[PDB]
Structure formats: C-alpha cells, structure tokens
Amino acid sequence: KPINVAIFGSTGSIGTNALNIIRECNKIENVFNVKALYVNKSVNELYEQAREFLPEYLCIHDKSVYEELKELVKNIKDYKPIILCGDEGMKEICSSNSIDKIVIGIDSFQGLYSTMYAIMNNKIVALANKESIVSAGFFLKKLLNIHKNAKIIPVDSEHSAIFQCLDNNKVLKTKCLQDNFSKINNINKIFLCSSGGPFQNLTMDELKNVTSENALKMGKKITIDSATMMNKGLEVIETHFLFDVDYNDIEVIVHKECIIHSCVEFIDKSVISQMYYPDMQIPILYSLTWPDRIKTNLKPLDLAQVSTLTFHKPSLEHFPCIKLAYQAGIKGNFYPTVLNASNEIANNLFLNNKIKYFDISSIISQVLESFNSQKVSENSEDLMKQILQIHSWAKDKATDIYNKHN
Amino acid sequence: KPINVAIFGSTGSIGTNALNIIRECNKIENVFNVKALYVNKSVNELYEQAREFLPEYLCIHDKSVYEELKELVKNIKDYKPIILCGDEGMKEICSSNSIDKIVIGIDSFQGLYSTMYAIMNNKIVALANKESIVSAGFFLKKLLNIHKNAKIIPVDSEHSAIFQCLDNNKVLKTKCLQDNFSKINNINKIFLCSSGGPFQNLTMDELKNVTSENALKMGKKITIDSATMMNKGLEVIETHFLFDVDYNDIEVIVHKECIIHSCVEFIDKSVISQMYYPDMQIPILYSLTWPDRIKTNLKPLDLAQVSTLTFHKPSLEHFPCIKLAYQAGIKGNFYPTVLNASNEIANNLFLNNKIKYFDISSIISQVLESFNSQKVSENSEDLMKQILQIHSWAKDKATDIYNKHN
Ligand SMILES: NC(=O)C1=CN([C@@H]2O[C@H](COP(=O)(O)OP(=O)(O)OC[C@H]3O[C@@H](n4cnc5c(N)ncnc54)[C@H](OP(=O)(O)O)[C@@H]3O)[C@@H](O)[C@H]2O)C=CC1
Ligand SMILES: NC(=O)C1=CN([C@@H]2O[C@H](COP(=O)(O)OP(=O)(O)OC[C@H]3O[C@@H](n4cnc5c(N)ncnc54)[C@H](OP(=O)(O)O)[C@@H]3O)[C@@H](O)[C@H]2O)C=CC1
Ligand SMILES: O=C(CC[C@@H](c1ccccc1)P(=O)(O)O)N(O)CCCCc1ccccc1
Ligand SMILES: O=C(CC[C@@H](c1ccccc1)P(=O)(O)O)N(O)CCCCc1ccccc1
Ligand SMILES: [Ca+2]
Ligand SMILES: [Ca+2]
Ligand SMILES: [Ca+2]
Ligand SMILES: [Mn+2]
Ligand SMILES: [Mn+2]
C-alpha cells in the first residue's frame, strides 16, 4: 500500500522539505504517492512541482492565478489533473478517499482552516503550524473527539522529537491532543530544547537597542520569534496541548548545538531523547511513516565529530516572552489565543523597526492584562467564532497599545 | 497482580540495587513479591535480607555454610522458609510456578548455569551477567527458540538503554537474541557508550605502568575490565547477540560524563538515546516492569546543571582489548567463549599484581590465536558440554602462558 499524501503549502519551507524527503525516499523504493499540492499564489513554482510529481489534484488559493495555472499545466504531456481553486478546492481535496495524510505547511492563523477540514475528513494531519494549536487547542481537542479516526502527528521539530521517544504500543491507546496522553504514556516531564536564537549572549542594555536586522542577519516571522524566544513560549503551549503535559513539567533548556531535539522524562525518571543534525526532513518523514520508519540516505550522525553538547537555563529577564507564554498557558481559557494574536502584531512591529525589543513583551503583557476569561462555548461552531473574535480583538488591542504610546 | 521475583546473587552489587528499588516500589502497594534469594556463601548478609523480605525460598550455593544459615534464620519468628542449597536448590527455584521473573546478578561464567535453567522454565530473565551472553550467545539463542515463553530482558546499563530506546510496539513482536530483531526494530546502528575508565587519558608510556591499585582507588572484576575497556569489548559482543546487530554496526563512544547511556540509530538515521545519572536502579526496575514503567522517587536529571556532554572515539592502541573482542565476535564459533575465559584469567592476574597492563591483551590474544574452530554441536546438552570444555581449556591455556613467560 503506497502512502497517499497531500502537501498543503507545497512551495514554502516545510512544503519543499516534505517533497525533498519524499523525492529521495522514493529513489530508494516507491513508497509515496503525492496526490495533491496546494499553494496560495506561487503558480510558477506549483507548475514545476506538478511537472515532477504529477499529482491527481492541484489547488491554488488565489482566484487571480487560477486560469494561468490551467494554461501552464497543459504543457505537461500525458497529464490530466483536477485543477481547483480556493477554500472549495481545499475542501474537495480533504474529502478525497484516495488521500490518507495531509502535511499542513501553511503558516500563521490561516493554517488552522485547512487543519480543521483535514480533521473533519478523518485524515492523518502532519501539522507543522504551531499557531493553530496555540490559538485553537481546546477546539482542536473537541474536534478530534468528534472525528475519532483523525489524528494530528507533530512536525514541529521538538514535538516530533518527543513523539519519536514514545512507545507506540502506548501511543496507539490514545492520540495527540487527547486528555491523559501523558498519563497513558507514563510521561513525567519534558525538556524542550531551544537553539536560543541570535541574542542568547547579549546583556540587558544590548537587548534594549537590538534591531530586527540584528535578529535576521528561516522565514522572518519565526526568526524574530526565535530571537525573542517567543517561539519557544509558543512551543511550551504546543507541548501542553499535544501531549497533555502540565506547564510545571515543561522545562525550556538552551542547547546551542541543536543536536538533541528534545527529551522526555518518564515516571521512573528515565529520560529518552531524539538526536540528529538540525533537520526538518526527519520530523516531516516521521509524520508520514508513523508508526513505522523507512530507510533514508541521510548523513549518519557522527557523535565523535560533534564532540561537545551544552545545556543551560534561559534567562527570563532577557527573554520575558517565555514567562508570558507560561502565564498565558497556565491561565488557560482563551489566553493562548490572545498571546498568539498580540505576538503576531508585536513581531511585525519589531520586524518593521516600529518598536524596540522590550516593547514586544510590554505590548503582549498589556493585551493579556486587558483580556477577561470568557465562557467557553460547548457548540463547536460557536467556539470557532469565539476564537476568531478573540484573535481579531487581541490584534486590534495590540495595535491600539502601540499607537497610544506612539 | 504482584510481580513474583527471584534475585539470584542477592548479596552482590546488582542484587543489593535490585532489592533497594523493590523496597521503594513496595512502600504503599504490593508491586513485587520477593519469592527467592540465592547467594554463594554470604550467609549473614542473606540472613538480614531474609528478615526484611521474608522470601518463600532461600538458597546458598556453598553447602558448607548451610547449617549456619539454618541457625541464623530460626531467630526470625513465624517464618518457615524453604532453605535449599547448590545446583539442586537453584533448579527447584527456577521450576517453581510461583516465580515469574528472575534477576541474574551472579558474576562470571558461573551465571550461565542459572540463566540456562531460568530459560528452560519459561521465565523472564532479567540478565545483568554479560559473560553468559558472550560465552554462550548462540546456545542461549537456541534455548530461547525452544522455550518460547522465556525472555532475556537486559540489565547491563548500555543494553537497558538500547532496549528502552526501541519502540515497544516493535519489541513486543520479537524478543532479545531472536534472529531478525534488528530488522523488526528498524535498527541501523548502535552507539555503545562507555565511561572510558580511569586510564582513558594516559599516554602509552604512562599506561605501560598502571597497576590494579591505580584502577581500583561494582565488583572488582568489572572494575578492572572497565580500566582495560575489555568490559566494553564484552559489551560489543553482548550487543551483537541481544539485538542481532552486525559488528560493523556497533560503534564504541567514550562519554566520560556518563549521562547518555547508549543510542540507537534507526534506518531513517534518526537517533534515540537514553539518559540519566549513572545508576543501576532504573535498568533493574525496567527489566522487571517492561513493557510498563512505574513511578520512582529518584533524583530528576538536571541537564542544565550537568551543562556539558562530550564524546570521542577510544584509541585501540591504548585499549587493545576492544580490538580483540571485535575480532573474536566477528570470527564467531567459540572465539567469544575463549575471549571471556582468557580474560577471566588475565583480569585476575593483573588484579593480583602478577602481570602488567599490556600483558592482559597479550595473554588473551595468544589464547585466541591458539584456539582452533570446532564444529558446533547440534543438540543442546552436547553444545553446553562443549562450551564448558572450551571455557576450561582457555582458562588453562591463559594460566600456562603466564606460567611460561613467568
Ligand atoms: N520552517 C520551519 O522549519 C518550521 C516551521 N514551522 C511552522 O510551519 C508553518 C509553515 O511554515 P514555513 O514553511 O516556514 O512557512 P512558509 O511561509 O515558507 O510557507 C507557507 C506556505 O503556505 C502557503 N499558503 C499560505 N496561505 C495559503 C492559503 N490560504 N492557502 C494555501 N496555501 C497557503 C504558501 O503558498 P505561496 O508559495 O503561494 O506563498 C506557502 O507554500 C508555520 O506555522 C511555522 O511555525 C514549524 C517548525 C519549523
Ligand atoms: N555491578 C554493576 O553495576 C554491574 C554488573 N554487571 C554484571 O552483573 C554481574 C554481577 O555483577 P556484580 O553484582 O558486580 O557482582 P558481585 O561480585 O558484586 O556480586 C556477586 C553475587 O553473585 C553471588 N554468587 C556468586 N557465585 C554464586 C553461585 N555459584 N551461586 C549463587 N550466587 C552466587 C554472590 O554471592 P556471595 O555474596 O555469596 O559471594 C553475590 O550475591 C556480573 O556478571 C557483572 O558483569 C553488569 C553491569 C553493571
Ligand atoms: O522551531 C523551529 C525553529 C526555531 C528553533 C530552532 C532554531 C534553530 C535550530 C533548532 C531550533 P528555536 O529554539 O530558536 O526557537 N524548529 O522546530 C526548527 C528546527 C530546525 C530548523 C532548521 C533550519 C535550517 C536548517 C535545518 C533546520
Ligand atoms: O558496565 C557497566 C560498568 C562499567 C562501565 C561504566 C562505568 C561507570 C559508569 C558508566 C559505565 P564502562 O563504560 O567503564 O565499561 N555499567 O553498565 C555500569 C553502569 C553505571 C552504573 C554505576 C556504576 C558505579 C557507580 C554508579 C553507577
Ligand atoms: Ca559450616
Ligand atoms: Ca522505548
Ligand atoms: Ca548494516
Ligand atoms: Mn520548533
Ligand atoms: Mn555496562
């Protein structure tokens, strides 16, 4: 049985790493059928991928470049795809009975929409977009309880590492984002590793004046998130939701070599970790082969050559985004939504030289303080409406706080 | 529901660590039932253990301290144990329907005899004794093919580590020492971690001069073997047999902080590792709970405090015992039997200040070169007698070489 996969956001970083490892793995033996590709706007790139991979379905979000895609594709001999457009095309792909697994490599809040529909169709969802879990974790949980045969399999590297450390006999008794996942897998505690980002050695005074150029010189948004360690704060909430680990049992550790990707402490106090070169091919591949593994031709890890690994605790004073993520997660309710939203705005303000480093945490903290816990709707549709309303409110609030001071 | 366990070698390092962790696990709930304790002659220590754990059976190998044991144990009120001695006693305990799991913490080739009988009675054998696997790997594989419900669960720290790094969903479909274990578990290669012992950074001139005093100041035997890295050599052969990993796929790494206990590379090139403070309580406990894990109160690993982990290749010029073990393993047949036996002798000679460090590998090498391959008996009982004959031959040959140069 080949593995029938759709790639959503095929032309981006995650998407192109997915097709890479699929390509290489297929050269060893033909295991993967790429059944569908979906992008926003990159019509020429999508064309090139369709030419190589010959998928049954092509979809582009933006209506404006639909006709252009149809024209380009006719150049391809012996190939009659179903060529689609927009949300409707995304839903048609998700409901195909010939597709088993969907890689969600669509960034930002937009990525939740396809994630939702992939679950609704009881697919395996290889989810890279941590913001969907941070903004909508409780909703995704409820949804995964309606759609019992759907599964989220984590792609974010640290989360993939945690998942790889587990015994699948116990994993198969539950699934990601389920209450009691950690209890069933006998997990006590998580070490969430971090690169620490480019500002890891700067003083408070140096940080006061750092700029986005300093942080940038991956995509801009996750790069800024890595500089402030808000990425890791988002990943702490992601860990809580994915594995049902309490916040007091998630420890961020700075591992600048980026060889140990994260570690899992069980109840006996034994720790199991996943290691490799920094790499998104293995996380992606595992999400598509779980619960099995297949041969690759990747470079073997040469531990003697690596020689030295280092670990240290991040300073919360230098990286206050971490503290804010814990605070929001511990509060629960819609605070993680608010955190994610306000960080989207502040990240962009910093990227564009409108605010300073410590203003990022300042704005986020102020939005969080202004929010009030809301009765969580038991209706799935109403709940999604609440998440959207709170998201838009928090972004607006972030922007207001910025413009007040400015 | 209690797990019924026998501790063979109850008064030694492994045996005392086993009872220490069982004690802690039995504080509130009756998790384990200590059914039997077996020792060589340490009759007063056994007495004290009998008072604590009140096993159904006590057994002493040395019949000359039997009456002293019967004397000591009558002081314990409303306790009527079955007190047995020697090989007969051992076999009656292994035969009991009241015993599920046996921890083998008997040292040297002597530990093979209870290992074999434990397998012949379809028990779970929690095996610390590596010499039995090196000396009789092929024989134990054959025995485990006959005795279908018997299992060897490793307790040696690195081998427990490897075993934990595997996915139990795959492990559960095979068992250690079974052909095709590595295929079923998708294992590509093993990183077999070592402390490197006390002599790891000596120059060749310095190493010429080392004495047993230097190496000593666990059993004394294993302690000298750690110094010469013959322990690791034996462990390579143990790896090969337990996990069906080819010798070219076992890599010794020196990791002096002893936090990472060993690592498995899978066929996708993902590596999984097991880490903890140097410790034998986790390996022993896991051998008795596998495929589950239970709660301990061990000190949690503080990776930030450890701060630094290092890795390098051992020098084979400095640690020639490693090379000899690989050579012996790869030759197969009874060469591992001869390696282990000649080492028993050479280890003891160095321990007692009779030979120099490089004479250890010299003696072992000469015995290996002297040995001629033998047709492997096809029946169990003859194959065992052949192992014993060769083992005795190689010890005598070692002593003869020593006597001649001396
Ligand atoms: N990059 C990495 O290594 C890691 C990323 N992640 C997460 O992965 C997610 C994806 O990130 P990354 O690859 O970096 O992002 P990119 O910006 O590189 O790629 C996003 C992709 O989504 C497509 N897309 C955007 N909007 C739509 C839409 N409405 N419909 C369909 N396709 C759409 C884009 O199409 P187009 O080409 O037309 O613009 C593009 O192919 C993020 O949430 C990130 O946090 C997680 C861990 C590490
Ligand atoms: N110590 C450790 O941490 C490690 C040990 N191992 C392996 O575990 C095994 C045991 O090692 P260790 O505990 O250090 O050894 P010890 O020397 O500390 O203990 C030996 C135990 O075996 C008993 N014994 C010896 N001969 C017999 C016999 N004929 N019948 C019954 N009991 C007998 C001894 O009894 P008595 O007290 O009566 O002499 C004692 O209880 C070895 O094969 C070693 O390589 C593996 C990894 C690490
Ligand atoms: O979250 C992420 C990115 C952010 C984290 C990071 C950054 C660099 C390395 C490891 C971790 P952070 O700890 O700084 O927050 N992943 O999960 C990325 C992993 C590998 C990215 C990769 C890039 C280039 C080449 C191959 C791999
Ligand atoms: O084979 C062994 C002993 C020899 C190996 C060793 C020695 C020290 C630590 C790690 C490894 P070696 O690599 O030098 O051959 N184990 O598996 C021991 C494991 C740890 C147990 C423990 C022992 C002493 C004190 C507290 C803990
Ligand atoms: Ca006597
Ligand atoms: Ca495992
Ligand atoms: Ca091989
Ligand atoms: Mn990540
Ligand atoms: Mn060992």
UniProtKB/Swiss-Prot annotation, chains A, B:
Inhibited by fosmidomycin and its derivative FT900098. One of its GO terms (molecular function) is NADPH binding. 1-deoxy-D-xylulose 5-phosphate binds at residues 130, 157-158, 195, 226, 231-232, 235. Its EC number is 1.1.1.267. It is found in: Plastid, Apicoplast. The keyword Secreted does not apply. It comes from the Eukaryota. Keywords: Apicoplast, Isoprene biosynthesis, Magnesium, Manganese, Metal-binding, NADP, Oxidoreductase, Plastid, Transit peptide. One of its GO terms (cellular component) is apicoplast. Catalyzes the NADPH-dependent rearrangement and reduction of 1-deoxy-D-xylulose-5-phosphate (DXP) to 2-C-methyl-D-erythritol 4-phosphate (MEP). Belongs to the DXR family. This is 1-deoxy-D-xylulose 5-phosphate reductoisomerase, apicoplastic. It comes from Plasmodium falciparum (isolate HB3). The chain holds residues 76 to 486 of 488 of the full protein.
